[PDB]
Structure formats: structure tokens, C-alpha cells
Amino acid sequence: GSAKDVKFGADARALMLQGVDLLADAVAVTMGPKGRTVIIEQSWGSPKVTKDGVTVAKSIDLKDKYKNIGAKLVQDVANNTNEEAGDGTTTATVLARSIAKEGFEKISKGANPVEIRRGVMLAVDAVIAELKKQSKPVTTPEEIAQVATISANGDKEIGNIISDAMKKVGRKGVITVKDGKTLNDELEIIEGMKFDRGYISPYFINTSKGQKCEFQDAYVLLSEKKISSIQSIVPALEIANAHRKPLVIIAEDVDGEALSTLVLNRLKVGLQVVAVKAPGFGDNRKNQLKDMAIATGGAVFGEEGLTLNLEDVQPHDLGKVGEVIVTKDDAMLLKGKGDKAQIEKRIQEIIEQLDVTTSEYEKEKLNERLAKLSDGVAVLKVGGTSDVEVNEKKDRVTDALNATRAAVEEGIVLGGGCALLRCIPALDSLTPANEDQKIGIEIIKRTLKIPAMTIAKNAGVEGSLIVEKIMQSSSEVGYDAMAGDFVNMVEKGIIDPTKVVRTALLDAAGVASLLTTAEVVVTEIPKE
Amino acid sequence: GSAKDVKFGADARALMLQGVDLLADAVAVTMGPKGRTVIIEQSWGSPKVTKDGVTVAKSIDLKDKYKNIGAKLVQDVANNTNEEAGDGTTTATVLARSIAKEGFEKISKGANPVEIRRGVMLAVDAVIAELKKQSKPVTTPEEIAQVATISANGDKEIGNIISDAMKKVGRKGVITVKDGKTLNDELEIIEGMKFDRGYISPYFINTSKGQKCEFQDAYVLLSEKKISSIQSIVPALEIANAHRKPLVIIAEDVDGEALSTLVLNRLKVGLQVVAVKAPGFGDNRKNQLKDMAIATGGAVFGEEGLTLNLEDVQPHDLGKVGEVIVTKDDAMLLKGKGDKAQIEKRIQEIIEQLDVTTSEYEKEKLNERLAKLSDGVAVLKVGGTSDVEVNEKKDRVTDALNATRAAVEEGIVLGGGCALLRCIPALDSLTPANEDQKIGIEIIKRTLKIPAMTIAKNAGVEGSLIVEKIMQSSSEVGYDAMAGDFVNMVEKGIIDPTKVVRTALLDAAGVASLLTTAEVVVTEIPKE
Amino acid sequence: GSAKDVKFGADARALMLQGVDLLADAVAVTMGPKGRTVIIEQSWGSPKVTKDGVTVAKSIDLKDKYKNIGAKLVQDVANNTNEEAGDGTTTATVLARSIAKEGFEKISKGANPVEIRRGVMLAVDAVIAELKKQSKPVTTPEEIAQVATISANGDKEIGNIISDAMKKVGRKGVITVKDGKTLNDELEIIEGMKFDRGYISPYFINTSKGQKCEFQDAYVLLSEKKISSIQSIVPALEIANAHRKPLVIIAEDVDGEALSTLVLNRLKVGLQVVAVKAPGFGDNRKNQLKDMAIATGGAVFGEEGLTLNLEDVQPHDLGKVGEVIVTKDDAMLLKGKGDKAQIEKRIQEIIEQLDVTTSEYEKEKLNERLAKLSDGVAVLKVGGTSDVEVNEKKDRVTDALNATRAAVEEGIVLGGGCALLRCIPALDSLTPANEDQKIGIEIIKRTLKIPAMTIAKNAGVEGSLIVEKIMQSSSEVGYDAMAGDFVNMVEKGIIDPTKVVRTALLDAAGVASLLTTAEVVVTEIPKE
Numbered sequence A, B, C: 001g002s003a004k005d006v007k008f009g010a011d012a013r014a015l016m017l018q019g020v021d022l023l024a025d026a027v028a029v030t031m032g033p034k035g036r037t038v039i040i041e042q043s044w045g046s047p048k049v050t051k052d053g054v055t056v057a058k059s060i061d062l063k064d065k066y067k068n069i070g071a072k073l074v075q076d077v078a079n080n081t082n083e084e085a086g087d088g089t090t091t092a093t094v095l096a097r098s099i100a101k102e103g104f105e106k107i108s109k110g111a112n113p114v115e116i117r118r119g120v121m122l123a124v125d126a127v128i129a130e131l132k133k134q135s136k137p138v139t140t141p142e143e144i145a146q147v148a149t150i151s152a153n154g155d156k157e158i159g160n161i162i163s164d165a166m167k168k169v170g171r172k173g174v175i176t177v178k179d180g181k182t183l184n185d186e187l188e189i190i191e192g193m194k195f196d197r198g199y200i201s202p203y204f205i206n207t208s209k210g211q212k213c214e215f216q217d218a219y220v221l222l223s224e225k226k227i228s229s230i231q232s233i234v235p236a237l238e239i240a241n242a243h244r245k246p247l248v249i250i251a252e253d254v255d256g257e258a259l260s261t262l263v264l265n266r267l268k269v270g271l272q273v274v275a276v277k278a279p280g281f282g283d284n285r286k287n288q289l290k291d292m293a294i295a296t297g298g299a300v301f302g303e304e305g306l307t308l309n310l311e312d313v314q315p316h317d318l319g320k321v322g323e324v325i326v327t328k329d330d331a332m333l334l335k336g337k338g339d340k341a342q343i344e345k346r347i348q349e350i351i352e353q354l355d356v357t358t359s360e361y362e363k364e365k366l367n368e369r370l371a372k373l374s375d376g377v378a379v380l381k382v383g384g385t386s387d388v389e390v391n392e393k394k395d396r397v398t399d400a401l402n403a404t405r406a407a408v409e410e411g412i413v414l415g416g417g418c419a420l421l422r423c424i425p426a427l428d429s430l431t432p433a434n435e436d437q438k439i440g441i442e443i444i445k446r447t448l449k450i451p452a453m454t455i456a457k458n459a460g461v462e463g464s465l466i467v468e469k470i471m472q473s474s475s476e477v478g479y480d481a482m483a484g485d486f487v488n489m490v491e492k493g494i495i496d497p498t499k500v501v502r503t504a505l506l507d508a509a510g511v512a513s514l515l516t517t518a519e520v521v522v523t524e525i526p527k528e
């Protein structure tokens, strides 16, 4: 329905390479310790300052249609790498540009670009096998700190903070990053159980130092349904008063009659009691209710299976907590007196539901439930002066967290781009089936030097000489661009997650090889 | 109402041929083993990379009205071939361009384009008869693998996967293609009966390894209507408890009372039971309910003809299954203990409804029902790195499946375009009625060489010499463009479905002959 | 309210003649056996390829207002001819152009265009009288086949198919043309009574070979109103069961209670029964119900005049059919055991309502009812490869059908344009009243040679010499442009319906004579 413009042969390839070169040239200035930042104008407000490869890649769109085709393909490379590994997007971008540029030169009348792509994929598989062969697992927390430091543009403090958080919540715990109102980064740990639901009526406050309600050795009444009637709340209060212990009432809500009874009894008698809304809004509400029931040790009133009416409440059906703190915003329970076997059984159940499928919203909830059950969560408040600084440092901290998680999962290799450099000899043991496969293998062999060359170039030195001296040295020696000298990378802590490297290489090679198999490009005539 | 532009004679033909030439030149670069891909810009997101003839054809629209008329006619050729045979669109496109170009040169003051078209169709009928004469049926699975490999651009793995799927589900089974999240292609076979309806309440889980419910030697209660009353569910539970066997309850839904009873009995007593919704939404729901009832062996409660009330449920009216697995997303029944004669009668019934008419939605459902009844379904998850790769490989896999189905239906002939080359002698035994019929026969004779010449040209060699050496050789010898030498096509497995070849030739000839009978072209003046 | 442009004298005539010449030049290339096709761009989809005069005429609109006035007048000529005779539109177009061009040259200061028009109309009346004098009726089916062959651009197969259909359904039967999904034309005859209403519930199927229900020697119950109550269906079933004969129940619909009873009895007892909806939606529903009742022999329950309640159904009030076949889509009744005198009386009634007036929807319905009552209908499924081919061949088949009907109505004359050529001597016996009448008679005399000249010119030969040799030959000799030699038209089967010829001549002359009486042309200034 719309008129089309068709281009053939080398002209379309030249325009697409122009687009790829522009996008990758913009991205590549942010690579390595001596990389610089990119300023991206935002339509609504203040501009963004970023050193992130995918953020720079996604913000570039070109007026020309063929240049935009090339730019969109490189954007796909960077976005796929970011989604899979969470880091290494600049490396993927520069690898993709190298592969596209090397493959466009090899297209001839007799060349077969599909067999060239087959050879490229074969070489990439060989290099990935070599990378997995030469990686080693992460054992000490010092390696975790070093990985987090390298991924955060050489910030020692960020790496130390991430290492401390992983030590205190586990290598596979829940760590969140949020902006901070202070000037320095802060790490806070939420232990026990804590949910963002405060007391309903500010009449149960008995401390007033921070407008909070603390109870020690308290009873817990968890109800699936709302508590509104007098008969549904009186027996629990009777048991609490007979046992002379404070009572926390966690429910969806407390309606007028029961709430009025609670406030009147608290004000007149002085009975210790507090009411809290139930965290969650759907099935998650029931799941967290059951989780708190197991952690404290008791029962949930109003379940569709048990249907335990509140009238027949018993002293043994109320949970016990060592301490409960209720603030206007959030409620927190510590030292639930529940049996440990049931808690471990629930944890095993949750990890089993963690391995059925994904829904983009559920596995995060299961991980949060496990963190609340077992070891708490860590929160990194990123400090800064203005919003742009906080956003830049937040991107760096997120990159460091993703890289540390990848290193925990799969291990580490040499940093600085030397991991791919050491895989060049693995490509000399291959026997290409035909000439086009040999061309593809040579393309990958030439591409493997690109990350180290780019890192050296950003440092102001000649990349070719640096790469040659790296390859002529021993296998444990690489180049420190920050210091500017040849060192032992493992000793100095310049290490990279092997998952990041292999993901970047695979995505870049896969997309650029398919790009270099084109002969005709069809675009839309620019009506507007 | 709109002003028109009228063109006469050779000028209109020249413009229409310009459009045809442009579209076919874009399409023809993707022909044969050494063909290349075409990049098509998408308005919404990432561009498409395709080697498919119809996909490239449908994406080309021209600003000029006469060129667009030619382009639309060639699009009709490619689309008709794709709809009929599912493959051979590039061959049809190049044949159509050849016929149009050869027929435009023969138009003279004394020439009769209608008689030329009559001669063209006569020659095409003769060539189709010769093609049917020289075809042979497919007998061994190796031929199936070879056809699937050739149609998938020479991918051995795709051909092997398709051959395995056809072996394990039958040559006329149900094979589906979907994208995969992994890097490699995978083939999964669904046996027995399986529908995408999981358990209603996650309280019947008794395994917890994968959050699934397994029952062995279970009773099955299938109800057409919803189960809501206590009286409509109690007797079935009574029979199941007396016989001490688990019970699956497949229905449209289970409302509050019956569901609450089921969960209460499962939680307290521990009675084995599970509830599943009914697959389908209209008449298909009833059809599949009857199918599962026949497969397991029992009755459907709530039918408009039988009206078997759930209250009078009997032990002999409940189906028996060797094993049932209910997962949160889907339910699966294996080893239904139903009589085989009734199953065969139902299968015959369904194949009979397969042969009444078509409705664009129904025969697929009947085929799915047969697959569920008899041999299961096969699913090919196509692996790749990015979405563009998966889409390209998915187009190739779909082409391979269509070609394999056509080869099973009608047989095979020599590949590489030699099947049409061997039909040239059949046109020398014709006696044209007049001069125009002779012109048409010569047009078809010259056109028959086009596919082989195009395949050879895409390989970087001279097509004319290759075709001459093919014609001067023995009938079993042709040209391997991938290897680049003259071989035995049947021995090397370069074979084509005869249905694809005859469909492409027929559609191309039919449309191009009618195109070449024009003297006046009327278009709309480009107001916008 | 809108500014106008006024033109006087010969300039306006020149512009109008330019428009007429353009439209008629586009139309005239499609005339005769050696005519070519015209491609018309369609806004929505694929372009049209047509050899039809009116289709080409209606698709031409010109930017210039005076040229568009001329084009609109020629469009009126072609549309009137198509509406009246269904064929001969190209002949009318060329005749109109000839008359306009010849009359524009004769306009002088002293000439009287109104008297010229009077002379033209007088000459046309004389020529029409001569044409009626020299025509002969159609007697043998071979002449029918020849007329259908000539009108279908010399397609023998189309003529044979039309002749067979006319033989098997009558020369004045109902023949419909629809597209076919096959490659070849097919003729299917629907006998007896058949309506597009299948069974309601697919539970009465007792054959399963084609999912159909066959009954032999069946009872028929026709009800004007819906059957919903038990008492309105039980007595008919009782009569059918006592007489042990199957029962077809034709009504508007069968509601829940009666339908449930029917399915229950069919499933359990095995009683032979079937239910079918009533064809039609308004008064036509009642008319066809009465027709079916008369054909089978019985009564309609629920008429506003008889009001025969279903409760008092009698064995003599149910129709008898030799055989009834009910499929999913349509129902068919054969060998109704009704008295023949009533059937003939009903047929006479319907032919009498055929001759009262027209409503653009009713006489077609009456003809359909007669065809269902007496001799059935014929359906021509036109085969082709693509939609454009099917549309072109469908236009040809419709033209052939219209010409065959006209030949049956009024007779035949010599084809090839010789019928008008033989009427030239009839214009030499006229005595013009004045000079302007003589001018008009000479205009018609010169115009009478135009169809033969155009047919000869399209064949690539000199039209003037061909026409001269035709006029110098004997009255039975004409020119075969397809063969290209002088032959006997009646012997060779080159004949034309006299109605078509006289309609074309009358329409063209009438419009062009009025066009040539203009002195001032007023158009709208082109604001947009």
C-alpha cells in the first residue's frame, strides 16, 4: 500500500555499514576504564549522562532508512546482550561492527555469504568452548569484590558494598538498588519479615520516640478475610487478655465495629493490641499470609480449604513472635516461634515453584518470599548530588550487580579483552570444509582482537602494539589500561564474568553474520 | 469520479515490464543453494531478513502506477503459488517474468496475443503431463529427509528433524512449528491426550517436584455442563471412594459449592481427586468432550441428546485412565481404557467429516482430534540467538515441511531445475494449429530453461553453458550448484516435489499469458 | 453558487470530440476475434484484465471537463446497451463515436442539427426495419452453440457448455454463473427442490459417508410458524411411527422442547426423523413453503387464511417424497408425490405474477420458483488459475449467456458486422424531406460500415478493402477475421443476435445525434 525503495548490491551494504559504523562509533567511546560518557537529550526534562552501551544504542535513530536498518540491527545486538547477561553491551556492539565490516569486504561474485555465516558460527562455537575450558569458578569474596569493582568502572567502594551485601544476604539473595537522598552510598538490610503496611489507626502507639508500636513476645492472629463483626474479634482478645500478651492482628482490613472495639479497649483498659493490613492484592496476599503463618506458627482464618472460623480461635492457633515493630508505613516481625521443619518444607516448596515456568512477575515474588523466610533483603541507596549523577551511578551499580551474579553463576576469565585474545590459537586447529568457511573463520579470528584494541585506544595508546605484546606474552599476562602497563590480571583483579563474554560474542556474531548475507534492501519512501 | 490516465501500445507494456523486472530481480537473488537474503524494513520494529520469494514479493510496492500494475500481477503469481503448494515462489516469479518478457517481444501488428496465450497454455499442459509422467513416488524415509534438506537451503539438521518427526507421528500427522528460547532446534512429541487446561485450585498437588498432580489408574468424570450443586458431585465421589481410585473431573467449570467440597475432602480426608476445565469454547468443546469420553470409555453428563444427570452416575459410566498428569497450565491423559472398536469408529467418523467441505477453521480441528486420538502431535521449537534469526530459520523450516508434505502427496522429480529441462523434448512433438500457437509454444520452450539458469547464475557461473551441458548429458545427470559439478541428482538427493514444480509453472504461465494480451492500461492520476 | 466556464461554437465541440475519441479508442481495441484486452488499475487490490466494452468505458474519467462530458455521454451509450441487451457494447461505442464525428463535421452556419438528428433517427428506423426483415429464428441447438461460441470470443468449450445447459434445463431456464476453484469449467444441474438450509442438530445423520441424511418415501410436515410445544409435534411423530415412515419437518425453526424430543426419540428409539429450517426471510418464505407443499402434496400449518393447527395433523395432510437428502448446508427433495394438475396450476399462477410489473428483486424469485417446480437450475463454475483469469472468463461467459438468451428471444443475423452492411441499400430508397435530413441519412449510411471496418482493422488488415469486397460479394458471403478469408457466415457459424445489433445501433444513434446538436457547453471551473 506504501511505495517502496529497493536497493541492490554494494550500495545498500555501504549505507547499512554507515549506519552500523555511526552507532558503534557513538557506543565505543564508553568502553574500558578510560571510556567517556554520552549525553542524551530527553524530551521532557534534564538530559541523561550515561556510560552504558545499550542506553546509548537505544537512543540513536537515523533519518536515512538504510542507515536506520543497520542501526536497528546493532540495537538488537546490544539489547539482546543486555537482556541475557545484563552487562557487556559495548563489547557486543564493537564485535558486531567488526564482524559486519569484515564480512562486507569479503562479498564477491563467487563468494557464498551463507557458507561464510556457517563458518563464522562454527568458529564462534569453538571460541565459546575454549572460553568455557579456560574459566575458573568464584570461591572467595575477594573475587566477588574484584568483579564488582571492575564492572563499576573501577569504583572500590561500590565493589566493597556489593561484596558486603552478598556476604550478609547470601550470594543468591535479593539485592535491590534505589536512589538515595544522601551524598554517599548506603547499604541497609531488612531481616525477619517486613511488609509495607502500617497500623490502621494511630492509637496503638506506645513508644512515641519514633511514633512506633513495639511488642515483645506477642501473639499473632492472621485472617484471610476482613474482621468486622464483634464475635469474630472478641475471643482472640479474650485469649490475649487471659494470657496477658500483646496481640497483632494481620488481616485484609478491620471494619468499623471491630476497629472501634480495639481502639476503645486500648484506650480505656490499656490492653496491648495492634491491627495491620495484609500485604498483597491477589493470590500473593494469600501466599504471604500463609508464609507468615508458617514463620510465626499458627493458622490462617478464612481459607477456602480450611475455613477456620474466627469464633473457634484457640491459644495454640495464634502465632508467637519474639518481637513486632509497627510503624505508620510498615510492619516488621522478628523471631517467629514456629517449627523449623515446616519452615524448611515451605522453603523447598517455594524453590520448587521457582522452577516450573516464568511469567515476568512471579519468580521475583518467589525470590522475595524466600528472602523474607530465610536471610532478608539488601537495599543499596545510591547517593549523589543531583538526579543525573544518581542515575549514572545507578546504572554503574546495576551493571556491577549483574556482573557479580553472572560471575557467581558461571565463573570468571581474564579481563581487558584478553579472554578472547587467548582463544585465537583455538581457531588455528579448525579445518574449514570449503573456502567460505575459511573466510568466516578468518573473520572471527580478526574480530577476536577488537575488545582489547578498543580498550587500548580509549586509553590514548596504540591498540595494535598493545594487542601484539599481549599475544607475545605468557598466558597470565595482560594489559592494565588504567595503570597503563602489562600486569597479571588475576593478581590485579581485572577479571570478567565468562557468561558476559560468551553472551556478547554469541549475540554479536549471530546478528552480524545474518546481516552480512544480504543482497537487496527494501525500505519505505519517506512520505513524512 | 476520479480522473484517469490511459496509455496505449508499447509504452504501457514497457512500464509494466519495468515493474515486473524490478520485482523479479529483487526476488531472484534468493534462488538456489547460493542465493542471498533480502532485508525488508518493518514500520514498527526490527527489520526482517528473508530468503522467501513470496515474502520479498509482497513487500514491494512502486510509486508508478504502471510499474505497480506489473508488480501486483507478479505478486499474484507468487501468492497463488505459496497458497497452493507452500513452496516454489521464486521459481514461479522467475517463470512469470520470463513469460511476460518473451511475450512482449512477440506482439506485432499481425500477431494475436489471445492465440499466443492459447498456445502457451497448450504447451504448459503438455509439460505438466510430461512432469507427471516422469515423477516417482516417495517410499523411504531417506527420500523424506533429502526433500526436507533441499527445501531448507541444504540444512541437514532440519531435514533430519523433520524426517524423525514424520517417522514418529506418521507421514500425515500434525507437525507444528514455533519459536524456541534455546539456541538449537528441538523436537517434542505430545502423545495420548493433552489439552491446555490446568487444575482450578492448586490444592490437589500431591507430587510437588514440578508442582504437578499424578494419578495412576484413575476414574474420569466428563460433564458437558458446569458442576455446582452438592448433589451433582457427591455420588461420583462416593463411587470413587468406595472403589478407592483417584478421580479426575473434566467439566466447563466447577462452581463454589462443589469446588469447596472437593478441596475440603482432599485436604482433610486425603481423598485423591482433581478438577480440570473443558478444552474448547463452542461446538469444539462438545466434540473434544465426546472424543475424551470415547478414548477413556464412559459417558458425557449434560448432553442435549442423552441428558445423563450426574445424580445417576454409575461405576461403569466413569472412564478409566492408566495415568493422568495435571499441571498448572495443561492436563494430560495416557492409556485410556476404552474399547478399540469405538475408537476406530470415531476416527472413521472424523476422517469422514474431514471430506465434506472447508471453513478455514474446521479441518485443522479435525486433524488435531485425529492426532490426539491416534498418534499424537509433533512440535518443532526453532532455536536462534535473536528474533530475526528465528524468523528466518522458521521460514526455512515451514518451507521444508510444506515441501515434504507435497512430496508425500504427489512424488518427486529431479532438482536444480532439471525437471523442467527434461520436458523440452515433449514440446517438439506438438503441432501448433497456427503461427500464434507456435509462438506461444516457443515462448514456453524458452522459458523452461529459466530456473536452472537462475540457479547457476546465483552460483557465480555462466548459466547458459551449465544448461547446455545438462541438456547434452544423460537423463539422470544434472548440476550441483552447491558442490559446483555435474552429478546424479537422485543419488545426491537433489530432488523436488513434483506438485511444487507443476504448481509454480501453471500459476506463472496463467498469469503472465493474460498479462501479455494487453493493449491499453488505465490507471488513476496520482492526486496524492 | 459555483463559478462556471462557458464555451461556444467549434472549440467546445472539438474538446468533446477529443473526449469521445479517447474513450472510444480505448474501447475499440477489444473488438472482434483478434481484439486485445485492457488492464484497469483497482484501488483496493489486483488490477482487472477485461475485454468488455462497458467495463472499459465505465472506468475512464478525464480531468478536463469538456472531454469528460464527451466521455460521460459515450459511457451512457455503452451502459444503456449493456443494460438492455447484455452484449454489443463495443459496437455501440464505435457507432456512437462515428456518428458524433460525422455530425460534427456537418455543422455549418446554415445547417440545422435538429433536422439532421431527425434524419438520423429516420435512417436508423429504416435500418432497424431492414434488420428485422432479414433475421431468422433459432431452431437447432447447433445454432445456440454457435451463438454462444461467437459471443465468448470463439471459445468452443463455453459454447458447448451453454448449449448443454440450455438443452438440459430448457431454453428459458435458470442458468447462474459463479467462480470455480478448479482449473476447468464445470456444469452442475440442481433438480427437484433444493434450498440452502441444512439440519439443525447433527444428530439425525444416518449415512456418515458424507455426513448426510437420506430418507426414502418420506413424510413431509411443513409449518409456517415455529414448532416449540410438545403438543405441536407429538401427533405428527405418532402418525409417522404408526405408518413406519421417516418424517422431514420443515419450519422456520424448532425450539428447545420439540428439538429435544426429536433428538431424544432419534437417539433412543431410532425413529427416522429430520428437522430443517424454512428457506426465505419474508413473503418469499411463505411462497416457497406453499410451493413445496404443492409439489409434495399436503398442507401448510400456520397460514393466516387456513390456520391449520398442528394438533389436528392427519395422515393425508402430510406430503410424500420419493427421496429426501439433508446435508449440513442444504436440503433436497426429489419425487414429490403430489397431484400434477395442482402443480401445473401453481406454475401458471407464477407465470401470471411474472407479467404484472417489476421490482428489481421479484421476477428473479418467480423464475427461481418455476425452475424449482419444473426443470431445475444450471450452475456454471468457471475455472481458472488466479482471480483475474476467472473474472475475465466470467465476463466472457456472462456475455455468451446474454447473447444466447437474446438469440432465443429474437433470432439471428450475419455476424462480423455484415448485418449492418447489408442494410446500406435500404437507405438508398429513402427520400429526405430537406437537405438536413439527407445529411443525417448520409451520416447513418457512412456509420453502417464502422463495425466491420473496426473488426478488420483489429485483425491487422485494411478495413476499407475488406468492407468493399464484402459489399461487392453475394448476400450470404462475409469475412472471417479469425481465419482471415471470405466465407459463408451462416455455414461457418458467425452469427449475431439481431436484438443486440438493433439495440446497439438505436442507443448509439440516439445519444450521438443529441450530442451533435450542441452549440454551447457549460462546465464548472476546477476549484479542486
Ligand SMILES: Nc1ncnc2c1ncn2[C@@H]1O[C@H](COP(=O)(O)OP(=O)(O)O)[C@@H](O)[C@H]1O
Pocket (backbone or CB within 6 Å): A030, A031, A032, A033, A035, A053, A087, A088, A089, A090, A091, A092, A150, A151, A154, A414, A415, A416, A417, A455, A479, A480, A481, A482, A483, A494, A495, A496
Ligand atoms: N583496569 C582495567 N584495565 C584493562 N581493562 C579493563 C580495566 N577495567 C575494565 N577493563 C575491561 O573493560 C571492559 C568493560 O568495559 P565496559 O565499558 O563495561 O564495556 P561493556 O559494557 O561491554 O562491559 C571489560 O571487558 C574489562 O575487561
Ligand SMILES: Nc1ncnc2c1ncn2[C@@H]1O[C@H](COP(=O)(O)OP(=O)(O)O)[C@@H](O)[C@H]1O
Pocket (backbone or CB within 6 Å): B030, B031, B032, B033, B035, B053, B087, B088, B089, B090, B091, B092, B150, B151, B154, B414, B415, B416, B417, B455, B479, B480, B481, B482, B483, B494, B495, B496
Ligand atoms: N545443491 C543444489 N544444487 C542444485 N540445485 C539446487 C540445490 N539445492 C536446491 N536446488 C534447487 O533450488 C531450488 C530451490 O530454490 P528456492 O530458493 O527454494 O526457490 P523456490 O522458493 O522457488 O523453491 C529448487 O528447485 C532446487 O531444485
Ligand SMILES: Nc1ncnc2c1ncn2[C@@H]1O[C@H](COP(=O)(O)OP(=O)(O)O)[C@@H](O)[C@H]1O
Pocket (backbone or CB within 6 Å): C030, C031, C032, C033, C035, C053, C087, C088, C089, C090, C091, C092, C150, C151, C154, C414, C415, C416, C417, C455, C479, C480, C481, C482, C483, C494, C495, C496
Ligand atoms: N470469427 C469471426 N470473424 C468475423 N467476425 C467475428 C468473428 N467472431 C466474432 N465476430 C464479430 O465480432 C463482434 C464481437 O465483438 P465484441 O468484442 O463482442 O464487441 P461487442 O461487445 O460490441 O459485441 C460480433 O459482432 C461478431 O459479429
Ligand code: BEF
Pocket (backbone or CB within 6 Å): A051, A052, A053, A054, A086, A087, A088, A089, A090, A399
Ligand atoms: F556498557 Be555495559 F552495560 F557495561
Ligand code: BEF
Pocket (backbone or CB within 6 Å): B051, B052, B053, B054, B086, B087, B088, B089, B090, B399
Ligand atoms: F522461496 Be520458496 F518459499 F522456497
Ligand code: BEF
Pocket (backbone or CB within 6 Å): C051, C052, C053, C054, C086, C087, C088, C089, C090, C399
Ligand atoms: F463488449 Be461486449 F460486452 F461483448
Ligand SMILES: [K+]
Pocket (backbone or CB within 6 Å): A030, A031, A032, A035, A051, A052, A053, A090
Ligand atoms: K560502556
Ligand SMILES: [K+]
Pocket (backbone or CB within 6 Å): B030, B031, B032, B035, B051, B052, B053, B090
Ligand atoms: K527463495
Ligand SMILES: [K+]
Pocket (backbone or CB within 6 Å): C030, C031, C032, C035, C051, C052, C053, C090
Ligand atoms: K469487446
Ligand SMILES: [Mg+2]
Pocket (backbone or CB within 6 Å): A087, A088, A151, A399
Ligand atoms: Mg560493564
Ligand SMILES: [Mg+2]
Pocket (backbone or CB within 6 Å): B087, B088, B151, B399
Ligand atoms: Mg523452497
Ligand SMILES: [Mg+2]
Pocket (backbone or CB within 6 Å): C087, C088, C151, C399
Ligand atoms: Mg460480445
